[PDB]
């Protein structure tokens, strides 16, 4: 079995990553955080966790629920970049695929900034730092997608994904962008899934195929619903948004693409057991995060499998979102729903 060879180049990484895994905030620790009175207490409490002294450079009067999000995220990004720097070959190739998604977000976020005439010096403070590439600010220059493709996006690794973007009208608004935004993901996920199928060893292969499958389903259910915002979005446009790799495909994705009402979507999901209950009751966004963490928790049980990088990343992403939710409740001095974080560990 491949665990025999895996450690040749990744044994060091697998150790460090699981080092981070052992640092994740536990169910009990969130409760100890929940009891704080102020952000100044939340900082002091956090110092007892594996987050350590990260905020020690921030004055008491400077703490805000915004700044805590920035610093907590910054720690994650440095740890991610450190892990990437120590990698090579297919593993380095694998990690670079992860950042593609974030920079696809950044490109969309950057272009709408020009549609609304906001300054690059401001927009570049909201971009996601893992989605950074050299030419990113140059997106500010033009409006039509053809110019942006010809002058910038031809060069970035995103270039292959634009197969279906140029069908746009000659003039651009934000609504076109979110359609373009999704079209890029469809190509990106399908390419990423294909790359996993070819170049990643088992069991990590089957693990990642599961994780990416969930993401494809999550996007599908979101898009099938939110697309009803417009007076209409054509079914052959919807079919260009829904990715092909998910559990829903093709049996359910067709109905979702064809659906023109909520009850149509609900009927479509009624058949798939994994999601049979999601729309019938309870908060939808929590259910997705709930399943997402349970999948990551299960993924950690495997060994000598590079998928741990993805499981660690998504887990700590949710950890930040847990922290900010608690901090926001603390700062705004409202607590009746402070408990609603999601903690599988």
């Amino acid at each position, epitope marked *: 079995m491949e665990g025999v060879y895996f450690n040749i180049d990744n044994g060091f990484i697998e150790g460090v990553v699981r080092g981070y895994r052992n640092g994740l905030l536990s169910n009990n620790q969130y409760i100890n955080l929940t009891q704080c009175d102020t952000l100044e207490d939340l900082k002091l409490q956090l110092s007892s966790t594996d987050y350590g002294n990260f905020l020690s450079s921030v004055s008491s009067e400077s703490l805000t629920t915004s700044l805590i999000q920035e610093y907590a995220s910054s720690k994650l990004y440095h740890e991610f970049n450190y892990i990437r720097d120590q990698s090579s070959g297919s593993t380095r190739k694998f990690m670079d695929y992860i950042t593609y998604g974030y920079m696809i977000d950044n490109v969309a976020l950057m272009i709408t900034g020009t549609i609304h005439d906001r300054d690059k010096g401001e927009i570049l403070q909201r971009c996601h730092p893992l989605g950074w590439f050299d030419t990113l600010p140059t997106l500010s220059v033009a409006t039509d997608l053809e110019s942006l493709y010809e002058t910038v996006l031809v060069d970035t690794p995103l270039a292959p994904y634009f197969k279906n973007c140029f069908d746009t009208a000659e003039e651009l608004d*934000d*609504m076109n962008i*979110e359609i373009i935004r*999704n079209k890029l993901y469809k190509a990106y996920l399908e390419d990423f899934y294909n790359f996993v199928t070819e170049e990643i060893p088992e069991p990590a292969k089957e693990c990642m195929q599961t994780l990416l499958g969930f993401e494809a389903d*999550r*996007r599908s*259910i*979101n*898009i099938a*619903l*939110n*697309s*009803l*915002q417009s*007076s209409d979005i054509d079914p052959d446009l919807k079919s260009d948004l829904l990715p092909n790799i998910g559990k829903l495909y093709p049996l359910a994705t067709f109905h979702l693409a064809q659906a023109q*009402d*909520f*009850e149509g979507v609900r009927a479509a999901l009624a058949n798939v057991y994994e999601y049979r209950g999601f*729309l019938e*009751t309870g*908060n*939808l*966004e929590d259910h*997705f995060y709930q399943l997402e963490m349970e999948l990551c928790r299960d993924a950690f049980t495997q060994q000598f499998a590079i998928s741990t990088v993805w499981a660690w990343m998504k887990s700590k992403e949710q950890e930040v979102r847990n922290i900010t939710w608690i901090a926001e409740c603390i700062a705004q001095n409202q607590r009746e729903r402070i408990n609603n974080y999601i903690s599988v560990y």
Partner: nanobody, 120 residues
Framework: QVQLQESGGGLVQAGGSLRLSCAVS????????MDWYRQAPGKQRELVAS???????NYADSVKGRFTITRDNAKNTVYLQMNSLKPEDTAVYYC????????????????WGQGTQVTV
């Protein structure tokens, strides 16, 4: 953060009209699509009528032709009614709301009521 709950219903004699209401909070009709679902003693639950964001109104009129829709955005609540009730109509009626949270195609806001019983 949205709380839905409905009112009215209960037992009423056949052939009479009946009126149901469903409150909504922390949100506005802008980007709102909203429905009623029946659930008979037979376990399955089903759509009967709807308010779309654009003001169109879906119905199960093949079997609920005398159920009706009302738009209440000026008061940010719900008052939907039916005429000439029949004994087969005895069901828990749930109001449902789908919120187009934002442009970003994250998971949308989705909300259900607690269900109002109806008896004939």
């Amino acid at each position: 953060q949205v709380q839905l709950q409905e009112s009215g219903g209960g037992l009423v004699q056949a052939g009479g009209s009946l009126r149901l209401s469903c409150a909504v909070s922390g949100s506005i009709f802008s980007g709102n699509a909203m429905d009623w679902y029946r659930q008979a003693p037979g376990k399955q639950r089903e759509l009967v009528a709807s308010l779309t964001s654009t003001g169109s109104t879906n119905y199960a009129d093949s079997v609920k032709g005398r159920f009706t829709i009302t738009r209440d955005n000026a008061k940010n609540t719900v008052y939907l009614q039916m005429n000439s009730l029949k004994p087969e109509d005895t069901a828990v009626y749930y109001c449902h709301a789908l919120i187009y949270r934002s442009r970003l195609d994250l998971a949308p806001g989705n909300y259900w009521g607690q269900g109002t019983q109806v008896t004939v």
